[PDB]
């Protein structure tokens, strides 16, 4: 019964942990290199640039760790307001989080640990109370500096929703109409959206502007995850026969759109991207169930299960995709950084071994020469030789630790970053 979102949660913690270890390892390496480089008793076995490079990598790794700590899954919802996309988000969250059509901007729902909802617009990080959904709606309408290119974050309490605790963000978009100016949308707000949900009506033809947007999604993102939720499916409660016909036809239209028109999916998983739902039915049932209220429509259990099925296939989709797209570049960077430090330690090991061999040979030659200070001078070179030997041992250990991290990273890649 574990949410598939736990795959993301698990991978995020695992990659953050590796970067913690990578940072610790580079720190130890930097400390070792610096100490070595400052050793005025030896001919140089490392260089300032190697020290600076490894301090530089430490900085970069800590910087990346900060990005990795904040990475989250994002699903973005699109479509006409009248088709109910906001109710789909509300149903998924088991509550009336977003106002539902009678909202200018993008609404980005994020979990907060605080026990009260509030808004954060983004050009100004200034909040607005959102004690109720009506007061939320009025707070957006009150704010006339808002438009369909503004994003407000709806900070919604963690405790109410496990989706939000598992680092899911849910973005509602402005409702689409014919002349909705939306070519800004993908670059400004959707580059990090792991899933795009089109919420449509099974019987209403898709607007050209809606199709145009999902063309742009398919042109701008690499293998974007597109779901089509065909809302108001509860009409099947009273016209099951006609809605079954509608289902077959629209299932085929949506498949052709996803597979042939957009080319973002095979036919084999079309049934996993195209769902027929009744969001407000689900949301109503969930609001009552959350309170222990009892309860109805014909086909209701079937429609509730379909929505739950959508949710599960969505959570599997977003969790697996987001892990891949949001961690793969940093996993690759981490391997490159590990390899850079590995090779410096190998360079140091080798220069220390070469200088050791040199000092051993200087020791043998010293024993061919005058007996004045011979034992003192052989001892000083014995000590240098033993430092060079310890440096080699230390560098080999650090080099093998870099290989360990490469191995952790390879295994993370294998488990979490497959196509
Ligand atoms: Ca360099
Ligand atoms: Ca030897």
Numbering used by the authors: 25 to 126, 130 to 322, 327 to 400, 706 to 755
Article sentences:
Outer mitochondrial membrane (OMM) fusion is catalyzed by the dynamin-like GTPase called mitofusin (MFN). We generated a modified human MFN2 construct with deletions of residues 1–21 and 401–705 (MFN2IM). MFN2IM contains a G domain and a helical domain 1 (HD1). In this study, we address these issues by presenting crystal structures of truncated human MFN2 in different stages of the GTP turnover cycle. These structures explain how MFN2 uses a primate-only single amino acid variance and a tighter G interface, as compared with human MFN1, to allow for enduring GTPase (G) domain association even after GTP hydrolysis, a feature that is unique in the dynamin superfamily and ensures efficient membrane tethering.
To investigate how Thr111 phosphorylation affects the function of MFN2, we solved the crystal structure of a phosphorylation mimic MFN2IM(T111D). According to the structure, the side chain of Asp111 is not fully exposed, and its phosphorylation may require a substantial local conformational rearrangement. Phosphorylated Thr111, as reflected by the Asp111 in the crystal structure, blocks the binding groove for GTP in the P-loop, and the negative charge is also disfavored for the phosphate groups of the nucleotide. Subsequent ITC analysis confirmed that MFN2IM(T111D) has no binding affinity to guanine nucleotides. Therefore, the putative phosphorylation at Thr111 is likely to directly inactivate MFN2 in mediating mitochondrial fusion. Intriguingly, we observed calcium ions (Ca2+) associated with the HD1 of both nucleotide-free wild-type MFN2IM and MFN2IM(T111D), and one of them is involved in intermolecular contact. Addition of Ca2+ did not alter the biochemical features of wild-type MFN2IM or MFN2IM(T111D).
